[PDB]
Amino acid sequence: GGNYNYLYRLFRKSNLKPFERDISTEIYQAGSTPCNGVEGFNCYFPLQSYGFQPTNGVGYQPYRVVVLSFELLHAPATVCGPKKSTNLVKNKCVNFNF
């Protein structure tokens, strides 16, 4: 029957700055005529909804996306990979790191 809860914005005045976010819901104004908060020609609601349905060809089915962004300000340190600890071979001239 269509999952109409997943919307996207399809009209904006100007492209986003990187990592900028815009949840407003003002009536878009395409033409020169002012809109006064009501719909009509050249006065469009700015949000559309994917109507997802299970019998959609691939490329029409929902994909979930996660974007990891590693940043490095100027602190002293922070999270990082794990670690691999070898074994202790006591009783032999060895090259060690503790």
């Binding site: 395409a30 109507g51 959609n56 060809g57």
Partner: protein, 595 residues
């Protein structure tokens, strides 16, 4: 301003794709599982699509059309701004729909009763089509031909006269001169630097291409006439026209039921691979999987993998009421389904290749906007489907796909049997199609007044087609309206141009696949360069003029009849030797009653 029209169409392109989807998804559930709780499920979901489109149509006239520069956004705007009906008065608009419903139910429910038994009565499709396709009795074919026209066609005569007046009013309010000029608006092309095409230019290109088929059609008409005199002696003149009730069906549209009387060498079996399919235990799925391997052989994509679950390749395991008719569906959102009830036969092995060709055409232009997702004209869509069927019916393809003894010998006697069966369907329908649209074009513009409709109809049968009526018909009959496409408001010139595009595509693809022999032995398997020649047209849609689409495959800007004649030159050479003692041509003075 033009940038407001672009923002108009993108709201259209995302409300339409969803509303067209579920209006076509509900039509799938009715077609594959019939209840009445599905017919009411598709009538309200069908009307939400139609009510939405007239709301956006009346919004489209706020933008002018000549203040636009981009050709693509102009093409989308003109296809949506089209008024069509609704230009009439609101009491004339309901009179036109009453006529179209009355003419459609006369054709489907009209009955003919026997004069020896008035309690037995036949409909057209069960019983009257079987007499015209199977009988060899002269008196029974003459009864079924005349009684369908005198009992059903006489009811359509006062309805078709009122239909011409109301359709000419609707066409002249949309700035055409008549309704025939409205039908020729499909082939019109406006201002794309050298690829233009006028709506009156279609009339000369049909008549210029037709006078090069008349040498080939005259030798086919003379050979069939000489073979019909053995089947009906004392009924056919050796220098005259053919009687209209001895042609294989009700209207003489196809001559394909005359093959058992006109076969050149009846002691050679025409090749039929149906027994080799049931000897290797081929299921329902093998016929499509070998069809998918044909298309991936030429360089075309696989099926979409939603194609295999959602489709219904047979009638179900339930005794399930579901219109069983081969077709290809394009519901939207990249969801392609094929609906057919396939049996293990070489017939449905071939129409599997035909119906998959509609899918591969549909998968290619799916990146265009919504209003340009059709064929480039009305004739391209069926023509791409039938060059897939011609390449799969060759014995060269059948012995490499595993279905013919590697020790098979094709002789020159079986190629004549195959080519003559093709010419009874291809060449035999071309003067019928040309004559019928020429008659309907002259009726709409008024060159034929209504006191000469049936006079000019039968003069054009004797002169163009070479077919004479067995009983004289005055102006109380309407013999064109007894055909389906005339009484159900359909255009008929799409069957003429599709036949010419089909051999232009096939000859252009076989020069790219490096063929060496005759054109009728060709196969485009294992190539890649031919598929690249085909794919460059398939992805255009309606975004380009159709004359620009033809040069991407053929290399010309117009339809041409010389590739059609090259297909039939082995038959045309053999036909001119069988008509050394015959008379080629016909007389328009002889009649089967005029002695």
């Amino acid at each position: 301003i033009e940038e407001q029209a672009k923002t108009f169409l993108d709201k259209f392109n995302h409300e339409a794709e969803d509303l067209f989807y579920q209006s076509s998804l509900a039509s799938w559930n009715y077609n594959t599982n019939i209840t009445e709780e599905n017919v009411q499920n598709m009538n309200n979901a069908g009307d939400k699509w139609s009510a939405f489109l007239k709301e956006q149509s009346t919004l489209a006239q706020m933008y002018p059309l000549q203040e636009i520069q981009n050709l693509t956004v102009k093409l989308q705007l003109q296809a949506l701004q089209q008024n069509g009906s609704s230009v009439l008065s609101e009491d004339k608009s309901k009179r036109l729909n009453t006529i179209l419903n009355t003419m459609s139910t006369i054709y489907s429910t009209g009955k003919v009763c026997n004069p020896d038994n008035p309690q037995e009565c036949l409909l057209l499709e069960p019983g009257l089509n079987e007499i015209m396709a199977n009988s060899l009795d002269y008196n029974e074919r003459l009864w079924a031909w005349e009684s369908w026209r005198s009992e059903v066609g006489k009811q359509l005569r006062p309805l078709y006269e009122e239909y011409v007046v109301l359709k000419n009013e609707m066409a002249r309010a949309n700035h055409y001169e008549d309704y025939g000029d409205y039908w020729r608006g499909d082939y019109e092309v406006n201002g794309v630097d050298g690829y233009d095409y006028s709506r009156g230019q279609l009339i000369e290109d049909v008549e210029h291409t037709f006078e090069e088929i008349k040498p080939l059609y005259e030798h086919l008409h003379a050979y069939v006439r000489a073979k019909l005199m053995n089947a009906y002696p004392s009924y056919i003149s050796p220098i005259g026209c053919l009687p209209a009730h001895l042609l294989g069906d009700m209207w003489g549209r196809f001559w394909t039921n005359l093959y058992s009387l006109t076969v050149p060498f009846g002691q050679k079996p025409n090749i039929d691979v149906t027994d080799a399919m049931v000897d290797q235990a081929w299921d329902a799925q093998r016929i499509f999987k070998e069809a998918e391997k044909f298309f991936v052989s030429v360089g075309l994509p696989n099926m979409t993998q939603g194609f295999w679950e959602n489709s219904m390749l047979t009638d179900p395991g339930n005794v399930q009421k579901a219109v069983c008719h081969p077709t290809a569906w394009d519901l939207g959102k990249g969801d392609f389904r094929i609906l057919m009830c396939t049996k293990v036969t070489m017939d449905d092995f071939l129409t599997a290749h035909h119906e998959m060709g509609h899918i591969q055409y549909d998968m290619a232009y799916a990146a265009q906007p919504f209003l340009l997702r059709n064929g480039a004209n009305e004739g391209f869509h069926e023509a791409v489907g039938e060059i897939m069927s011609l390449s799969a019916a060759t014995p060269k393809h059948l012995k490499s796909i595993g279905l013919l003894s590697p020790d098979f010998q094709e002789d020159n006697e079986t190629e004549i049997n195959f080519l003559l069966k093709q010419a009874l369907t291809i060449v035999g329908t071309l003067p019928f199609t040309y004559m019928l649209e020429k008659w309907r074009w002259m009726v709409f513009k008024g060159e034929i007044p209504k006191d000469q409709w049936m006079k000019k109809w039968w003069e054009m049968k004797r002169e163009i087609v070479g077919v004479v009526e067995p009983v004289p018909h005055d102006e109380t009959y309407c013999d064109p309206a007894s055909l389906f496409h005339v009484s159900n408001d359909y255009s008929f010139i799409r069957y003429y141009t599709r036949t010419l595009y089909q051999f232009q595509f096939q000859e252009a693809l076989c020069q790219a696949a490096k063929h060496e022999g005759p054109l009728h032995k060709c196969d485009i398997s294992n190539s890649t360069e031919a598929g690249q020649k085909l794919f460059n047209m398939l992805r255009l849609g309606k975004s380009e003029p159709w004359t620009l689409a033809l040069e991407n495959v053929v290399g010309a800007k117009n339809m041409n009849v010389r590739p059609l004649l090259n297909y039939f030159e082995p038959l045309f050479t053999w036909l001119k030797d069988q008509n050394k003692n015959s008379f080629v041509g016909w007389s328009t003075d002889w009649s089967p009653y005029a002695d």
